[PDB]
């Protein structure tokens, strides 16, 4: 590891035991009939500006 | 400079009290980043200061005086 045993806390990987189907529904994002985040981008959207 | 027109132009960019505001005003905040670095364009001083530069001017206004006098001694 490289770390001192004594300062450590068992932890959990949310991103593991997940169905690919729900994986996409947590991290992936697109402009395809989506753009739901713009409801949160507040305050300030851009919107979408230019590429990048 | 650009800021000078940018005051009068950011003036009425605002659109009512409605959430029509921030939808444009976040990109306006991006413009505020841009102008924030326009401040960098003026990051250092040239000639001193008004009126100390103006004191330099009046200094020239005294310095101009010999110029208007020695010619009288042309003959």
| DSSP for B18-62, written as a single string | STHHHHHHHHHHHHHHHHHHHGGGG-S-SS--TTHHHHHHHHHHH
What's the CA gap between B71 and B75, in Å, rounded? 9
In chain A, positions 32-51, which contact chain B (CB-CB < 8 Å)? 41-47, 49
Sole residue written with tokens 């020695």: B70
What's the CA gap between A30 and A51, in Å, rounded? 12
Query: CA of B10: how far to CAs of B15, B30, B34, B38, B64, in Å?
Result: 11, 12, 13, 15, 44
First to last CA, chain B: 50
Token pair of A37 as six digits: 């985040």
Q: Do A45 and B26 touch (CB under 8 A)?
A: yes
What's the CA gap between B51 and B59, in Å, rounded? 11
Stated resolution in angstroms: 7.8
H or E stretch covering B5: helix B2-11
Question: Which approach determined this entry?
Answer: cryo-EM
CB A24 within 8 A of CB A30: no
What's the CA gap between A43 and B4, in Å, rounded? 26
């Amino acid at each position: 590891d490289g770390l001192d045993a004594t300062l450590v806390e068992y932890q959990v990987f949310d991103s593991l035991r997940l169905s690919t189907k729900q994986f996409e529904k947590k991290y992936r994002i697109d402009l395809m009939e989506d753009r739901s985040l713009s409801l949160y981008m507040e305050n300030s959207i851009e919107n979408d500006s230019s590429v990048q | 400079t650009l800021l000078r027109q940018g005051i009068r132009q950011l003036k009425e960019k605002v659109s009512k009290m409605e959430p029509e505001e921030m939808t444009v005003k976040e990109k306006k905040s991006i413009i505020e980043i841009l102008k924030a670095r326009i401040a960098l364009k003026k990051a250092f001083l040239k000639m001193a200061l008004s009126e100390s530069n103006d004191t330099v001017v009046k200094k020239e206004d005294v310095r101009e005086s010999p110029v208007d006098t020695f010619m009288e001694n042309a003959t």
